[PDB]
Structures are given as C-alpha cells and as structure tokens.
Amino acid sequence: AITPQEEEEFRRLAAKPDIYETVAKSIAPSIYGSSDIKKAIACLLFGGSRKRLPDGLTRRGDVNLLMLGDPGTAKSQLLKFVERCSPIGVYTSGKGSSAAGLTASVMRDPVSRNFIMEGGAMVLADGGVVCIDEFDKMREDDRVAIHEAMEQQTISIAKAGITTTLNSRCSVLAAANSVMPTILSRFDMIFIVKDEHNEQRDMTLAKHVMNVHLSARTQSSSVEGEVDLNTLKKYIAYCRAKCGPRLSAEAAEKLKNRYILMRSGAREHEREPITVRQLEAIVRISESLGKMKLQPFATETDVEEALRLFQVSTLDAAMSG
Amino acid sequence: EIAPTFSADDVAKIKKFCKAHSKDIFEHLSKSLAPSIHGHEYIKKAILCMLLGGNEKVLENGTRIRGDINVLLIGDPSVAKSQLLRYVLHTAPRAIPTTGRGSSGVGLTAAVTTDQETGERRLEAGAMVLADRGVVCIDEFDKMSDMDRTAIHEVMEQGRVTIAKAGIQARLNARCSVLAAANPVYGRYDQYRTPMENIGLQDSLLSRFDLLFIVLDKMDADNDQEIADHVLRMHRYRTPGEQDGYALPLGCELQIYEKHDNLLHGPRKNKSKIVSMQFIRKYIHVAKLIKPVLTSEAADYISQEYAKIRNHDQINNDSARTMPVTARALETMIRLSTAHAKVRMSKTIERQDAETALELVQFAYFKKVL
Amino acid sequence: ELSEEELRQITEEDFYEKLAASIAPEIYGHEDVKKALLLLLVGGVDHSPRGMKIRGNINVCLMGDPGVAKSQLLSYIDRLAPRSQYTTGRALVLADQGVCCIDEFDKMMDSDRTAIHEVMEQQTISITTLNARCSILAAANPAYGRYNPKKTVEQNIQLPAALLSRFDLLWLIQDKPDRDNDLRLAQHITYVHQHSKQPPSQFQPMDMKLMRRYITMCKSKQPAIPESLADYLTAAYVEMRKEARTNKDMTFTSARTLLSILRLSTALARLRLEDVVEKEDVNEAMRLTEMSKDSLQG
Amino acid sequence: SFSWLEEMGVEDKIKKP
Ligand SMILES: Nc1ncnc2c1ncn2[C@@H]1O[C@H](COP(=O)(O)OP(=O)(O)OP(=O)(O)O)[C@@H](O)[C@H]1O
Ligand SMILES: Nc1ncnc2c1ncn2[C@@H]1O[C@H](COP(=O)(O)OP(=O)(O)OP(=O)(O)O)[C@@H](O)[C@H]1O
Ligand SMILES: Nc1ncnc2c1ncn2[C@@H]1O[C@H](COP(=O)(O)OP(=O)(O)OP(=O)(O)O)[C@@H](O)[C@H]1O
C-alpha cells in the first residue's frame, strides 16, 4: 500500500549522492558515535542480492554482523532500534525464556490431544532480520538450531514421527560481551567495539546523557537531518522489492587484484588469512550498497567502500586478538 | 515421489550418447557433475562412482558382500567440502542430510525413546535407518558422540542395526552409502600428524571407509587467481530474459547439453560442453539398473596390482601416510571396477575399468598419481 | 534329527578336520582357529563328581591386527549357532545355553567386566540369580593401531590380565606383507566374487543344516576321563609347568590351563562319538594350546 | 529402442510410457 506520491519521494531521496551518509546518520539518533557500526547496520538492513544458478543451487544474499565489546556500550538499544526498522524482524534475548523458541517445536495440547507445529522465531522472521542479544548464553538446542539455519537456511523438525523441513532466510545480528567457534566463523563482519578515553568524547557523552535526563520533560523535541522510522521502513521495503544489482567488469577486476595482493601478503606474513568466503562477503556488501543507491550496477567506489568496511571490522578483529 | 518416466526418444538419446562417447564418457560425466566448484577432479570421480555404486554378492551359505562405496573428505575450511555434499543431496535420489551430531536424542542410528507424557516407549529410527539403500550426507563428522561412533562401527560393517534393549528385540536394515566431511581440530590441518590425530577420532573408523581424500588449502598465486576469476564469473551471472536491475521475486524434450553462456561455462574457445542435470539423473538411473559380471583378465590384473601396491606400501612410507594398505583395498578395487563398468554401459568388466579403479585407489592412498 | 546314512557319511576318520574346514570356507587360512571355533560350538562335558560342579563351556578370544576377517568369523559363528546374540562392546541372559558373540571386546566397561568375571566363574548373574550358561566368543583390536610383539598382551590391548587369562584359548593374528600369500589371497577373493562360491578343495564343504544336526548328535554324548590316561596327564602337565618355570615371561600354565586342557580333550572325544577320553584327544588339546602359545610369541 | 534395453536385461524393470 504505497501511493505514487511516496514513490516519487523515494526516487527523489535516492537520487541524492549523499544518501549513504544520510541513512548512516538516521540509524539510532540517540546513540552518540559509532558511525562505522551504523554504516554496517545500514548495509545489513538493505541486504545483498539473491542469485540462482542453472544447477539449482542458490547463493544466499544475507549479511551477518556480530558486535563484541565491553558492557555499557548500548548494544541492546541498537538491536531494538534495528528490530523496529526492518519490514520484518524479531527480538530474542539469549537464555531468557529460552530466547523465545528459535526452534520449531511440536507440542501436544493435552486436553485436545492434538499436535501443534509452531515454527521457531527464525521461521516467523523469514526474509527479515533476527536480532539476538547475549549470544554466548544460548541454550545448546538453540545453538544447534542457529548452526543449522546459518548454513543450510532450512530448519527441519523431526520429533514424534512428524518429519518436515521449514524455510528460514534471515540476516542474523547478534551481540555478545566476549567469546561456538564455527558460528563465529560463519559471521561476515565481526566488530570489536572497544572504548576510547578521548576527553572531548567523554565530556560530550556525559553532557548528552545529562541533557537527555534534563529534557525527559521535553521529550517532544525532534531531530533534524534524519529520516522518520516509517519513511525508512517504506524506503527499505521498496528498495528490497525493486532493485537487485550486480557487479561490473571493472569492479570485478579491481576486487580480484586486491584479493590476490591480500592473499600473497598474508602468505608472506605467515612465512615470517583471507579466504573465498570473505571475498563473497565483500561481494555481497558491494551489492547491498548498489541496491541502496537504486542502481543496476555497482561501481568501483562501492568495492572500495566495502573493502574499507571489511578492513575496519574483520581484519582489525583478527589483528587485535 | 516423482516417477522418472522414460520415452522412446529418451532411450534413443541415451543410446546416441553412449555411442558417440564410447570412450571418456566417465571424464565427461565427472566434469559435468558440478560446474560451479572449480577443480577437485578425483573427488568428483569418486562421488560419481558412489552414486553408481557396486554389486551385492549373496553367497550360498548366506554371507553377504556389501556393494556400496564410502567416501570421507578431511581438509582445511573454505575449500567447498559442504558444497559437494549439497550437490550430492540435490542430484542423487533418496538422500538424507544430517548434521553429524544426530537427529535429536535418536542419533545417527536407531534408538528407543519414551514419550514422557504417557511413559510409552517407541522405537524412533535415526537418519541412517531412514536412508536405507540411499546416500547419507553426514556433515561435520568429528562432532559425534561416542555411542554414535560405536554404533556406526556395526552399522557400516554389517549393515543391519540390532536393537534388543527394553525388551524389544529387533533388527533394522541400514544398507546406506555414507559420504562424510570434517574439519581439523587445531584450526589448520597438520600434514605431519596422522588423519586420526587431525580429525580427533579413532583409527578403525578410518578403516571402515573405502576412500580418504585430504584436501589442503593451497596459497599458490595462480590457483588463487583462477578460483577468484571463477567465483566472480559465477557472481556476475544474469539469467537470460531478465531486464538489467531486476530482483528475484522470492515467492512465498531432454537436452544432452546446455546452452553455452560465456560467463558460467567460460569461453574455452567453445571447446567445453556440460551435460544437463536431467540427462545426468536419467543416465545414472539406467546405469544403476544394470548388473555387470567380472572376467578373468580383470581378476588377474587386480591381483597383480594389489600385490604391487602392498609391496610399494611396505617400502618407502617415509612421509605422512593417509592409511595403511590392508586387504580391504581389494574389495574397494572390485567395487570401483564394477562402477566404471556400469558407467560405460558394458555388462562385462574389462581391463580399462580395473585401470581406472587403480588410478583412483592410488590417488586416494598415495596422494600422488601412479 | 539324523539318519544312519548320514552317520556313515560322517563316521569316517579325520572328519574332525573336515568339519573344521567346513566352517567359513570363504575365509582363506586360519585352520586352527576354525578348529577352536568348532570346539567352542560343540563345547565340553559337564560333570558332578562328588557334587563338584565342573562346567564344560569353552571361551575363545581372537586378537590381532584389524582387518583380518575377525568379524567374518564372528558373524559366521553367530549364524551357525542354534542360539546366539551378536553385540558390540557397549544380553548375556538371552545367550543362555548358546554362544555370545561380543565384537569390539576391548571397548567395554569394567563395571560390566566385573559381571563378566562373575559369569565366567559362576555362569550366573546375582542381582534372585539368572542363569548365564553362555559360552563367550570375543574379538579385540590393538589400541595403538598395530600390534607390537615387543609390548605385552596387556599393553597392546588395554585389558586386565586376569580376564585375558580366563579365556580357554587366546589367538593372535598378525598380518604380514608376504608377496606370495597376498597373491594367493587376491586370487581367492577374486574367485569368490566371480563364481559366487569358494574355490574347489579336496573335501566337499558340509551344509549348514547337516552341520547343525551333527553338532547336536555330538552334544548328545557325554564322555568321561579314565584314570589310566591321567598318568600321561601328570607327565604332560609337569613338563608344561617345568617349561613355564623355565621362562616366566608368558602366562603361567596355572590350574586353569589344566582344566581347559581337560575340557578340550573331553570335547574332542565328544566329537569322535566316544565315551572315553583317549591319548589322541590329549595330544590334540596340547597341539592347540601350543599353537596358541606360538601365536602369542612374536 | 526398447529392444536395446532388453538387450542388457533392463527393459523388464524400466518405467515405459
Ligand atoms: N552513546 C552511548 N554510548 C554508551 N552507552 C550509552 C549511550 N547512550 C546511552 N547509553 C547508556 O548505556 C547503557 C547501555 O545499555 P545496554 O543494555 O543497551 O548496553 P550494554 O550494557 O552494552 O548491554 P549488555 O549488558 O546487554 O551487553 C544504557 O544505560 C544506555 O542508556
Ligand atoms: N573451487 C572452489 N574452491 C573453494 N571454494 C570455492 C570454490 N568455488 C566456490 N567456492 C566457494 O567457497 C565457499 C566455501 O563453501 P563452504 O561453506 O561449503 O566451505 P567449507 O569450508 O568446505 O565448509 P564447512 O564449513 O562445512 O567445512 C562457498 O561460498 C563456495 O561457493
Ligand atoms: N583369509 C583372509 N585374510 C585376510 N583378509 C581376508 C581373508 N578372507 C577375506 N578377507 C577380507 O578381509 C576383509 C574382512 O574385513 P572385516 O570387516 O571382517 O575385518 P575385521 O578384522 O573383523 O575388523 P575389525 O577388527 O577392524 O573390527 C574383507 O574385505 C574380506 O574380503
């Protein structure tokens, strides 16, 4: 249910060259700082492009994040905000009420003796986002379910004779305090959210918190330069349902050259690593940017930005550890 | 299910394919088995042989010789081991995927479970029992409980899981082919350590399997360039008839070859042809139906080659050896020869089948051709 | 049952070796092992002199390198036996008056090994006692991948020494890379897979049903040991104990050795359809024991 | 065509149209 006026508004908004930074700022206005994390969340929200080959195998187009860091960095608020901006979403907190279900279950209603086949939260969030908090506290059964869903994207139910396989194609955004290793390997971008003691940053953060507490009465005050949540929802839905981009030949050449150089340098350093999986992750990030700008081809600048994001998140996480 | 009906034109096409490719048909099928994955020629050949299978000989006294081939793949991550499992699951009929850990409390084998609401005990069948006369694509073989290992011993040896606990004395048929993959425990595969050390398991389980391929991640610049080029070509593909910029909806006559697309197949001067999936399935079915019979020449050649192989294994073995050469290699060679005879559509095994079986076995054990 | 014509057909001398070879003709070699399996299947003779219960059940253990057709022999014995249950290391009551085939015997639990000790000493399970008159056939593999003659029996196959000593006969099968033997084995296996039957031999293999009939007929007889032959038993056992005290490295010829010798001799006389144990039975039992001893030595 | 299937003893167990 979108009027032509809203479609015209979306076209005008996407036509701007600064749409990427605007979307980055629009995410979580209350939380101060962490621009790179906001950009990564934007990339996750817009998502990659799904493909199908003649053999019948389908390459997935989802992007998965993971936020590790010290407590008190407002991960939960960010996850809740993300859950309210995707067209489809769900919030499950680890080990709390078994983190919702996360597993398709077959219970038996005792009075009626019938068998009911509720799907897990992942099934309910097909084609959307699944925000998980306290990832390390997950129950073992839900850990198995997560391991299965992130690999094959098909949740299977085999209990009490009933044997079916459901479908779950969701982008997983999880946050944990500290370090299962296989699942951490499945994730595309791993952000280690550290802390800084810049006096200006600390003073600004303290002032912002104090001002929020002071203006609790003045909560009606608005923000400028951002996008309303409903507008963001509609824009995300429209971009997802209209434009699926692809790489260009020059971008492919640049990415291949960068990958070859990176692998040669990594091998030389080990003599004193990046694998194809991370190359595909970079491809999906580039496609997500291209889809965000409503274009049928991703240029070289998208590849450069994806490389920068990957270097900031995954390479830095590997180096720090 | 889906019945694979055949017509006269289908049989004519199959006969023409056999005649025009009286030789190197095995090579064409292996190459066309999975085009997206680059390299891994011998692994694809072994997978094709597993799909075709062997022959079961039931002797007069009643002893039965199993006719299924088992393959196991150990190596570094990000080398497309699971993609081969998915392709096998998508191609072969009656394929049941598992996670290695097991199906809830049932496990890979069968077990007796109680309802805990009325207390009644029911016998729930594991994945191995369900996929009788089929293919089981076990993934992450290392993540397995001890009881599962002990049961798998007997299931893979006899082929008949025996349950007598809880007063229910029964035997179930579990004659299944097992294709399994695993990852190293130390993050990266140590070549010097034995396969049982790297995978973190016993050695008799390694003895059960027929073939053991070790796939190592190589950092040669040329290999990385070729793999990156292939991946990018696959990731820039657009199906014909789609307007550029279109996005998938995500709703909620037999052809010998496929139309040549330079992005997917690659412009090898238009010298490469890939057989379509439907033709592969029908040909595999027809090959499954046949039952060849061995000849004297094949027996003599296999015996002499087995003697030479065991002599060569007694000497050398200075570097890391995947497996010792026991007497099970003879059974493996016979099964592979029957599989190749099936794929060639002949009804009598000859010397060439034994030669191909010898090449596969030597590559599987010595890791080097001849 | 049986007929007199079958009695004539199997009453010819050396039919002991004929029945031995008739067991699992597909397996190439291991003749003495097949004879031991036949003795286990027939079993010894129970006796109650002055109320002293003396069981006749025979227990055989197969040890050595993996992949030498242990499971083939186990399965064939399980199928040929009138009553038997096949089980892995990880039941006994159901095996009463039969044969209990236990594969992968080294992967058991010592808690159940205490009960196995009880059964091997008492043939009962005391929880009310349930009869456990089952002869146990066990197969084990080394825990280091291969058997080392340097290491002892306990070291190579981690298992308590006493439980190993309980078994009447212990067999060690080692795989040797001999070119000629490998060639013969390859020809044998190719022939089996080609003609769907074993290669021709000197004696026609017996059928399973006739084998069961003759096993039951032999089970009918209950021979006893005369005291006149027992003097030769004294000479044999004193010589055996002298050899044991010559080199104490191996298992001693304890009283269990003599009891097993008596049981084997009685079973051999039982197969010969005789009611009196003779010199030939003692000679054959000594030959089997010495063959097992040499198999243990490396 | 179907004769060739009978040649290898396979036509008896092939789903004809
Ligand atoms: N810009 C900010 N940076 C850090 N903390 C902030 C910021 N703005 C607000 N906060 C406050 O920081 C606290 C963090 O809350 P939250 O539970 O979301 O994060 P957390 O302690 O990192 O989470 P968890 O314990 O679940 O890992 C809250 O009290 C929130 O109000
Ligand atoms: N020739 C190739 N060699 C290696 N990887 C390839 C090749 N062609 C494609 N790939 C890609 O490499 C990735 C590896 O896939 P996958 O996740 O199955 O890896 P794996 O390490 O074998 O799996 P597992 O996690 O089950 O051990 C996939 O994205 C696949 O498409
Ligand atoms: N006389 C023989 N000597 C050696 N091998 C033989 C002989 N006859 C047959 N074989 C072959 O040996 C193999 C027997 O394997 P089997 O599973 O019985 O081994 P096993 O030693 O009982 O196993 P494990 O001890 O490892 O559990 C078969 O391939 C069979 O064809």
Numbering used by the authors:
A (entry chain 5): 314 to 492, 508 to 600, 608 to 656
B (entry chain 3): 271 to 522, 541 to 658
C (entry chain 7): 317 to 406, 432 to 468, 475 to 645
D (entry chain L): 378 to 394
Per the authors:
Here, we used cryoelectron microscopy (cryo-EM) on proteins isolated from replicating Xenopus egg extracts to identify a double CMG complex bridged by a DONSON dimer.
Resolution of the ATPase tier was improved to 3.5 Å after performing symmetry expansion, signal subtraction, and focused classification on one ATPase domain, and refinement of the most populated conformers. We then analyzed the interaction between MCM and DONSON in the dCMGDo cryo-EM structure. A first interaction involves the outer perimeter of the ATPase domain of Mcm3 and an alpha helix element inserted within a flexible loop (D3 loop, residues 345–395) emanating from the DONSON core. This DONSON alpha helix features a well-resolved Trp381 engaging Mcm3 Lys285. Our model strikingly resembles the AlphaFold2 multimer model, which also predicted additional Mcm3 interactions with DONSON residues Asp374 and Glu377 (not well resolved in the experimental map).
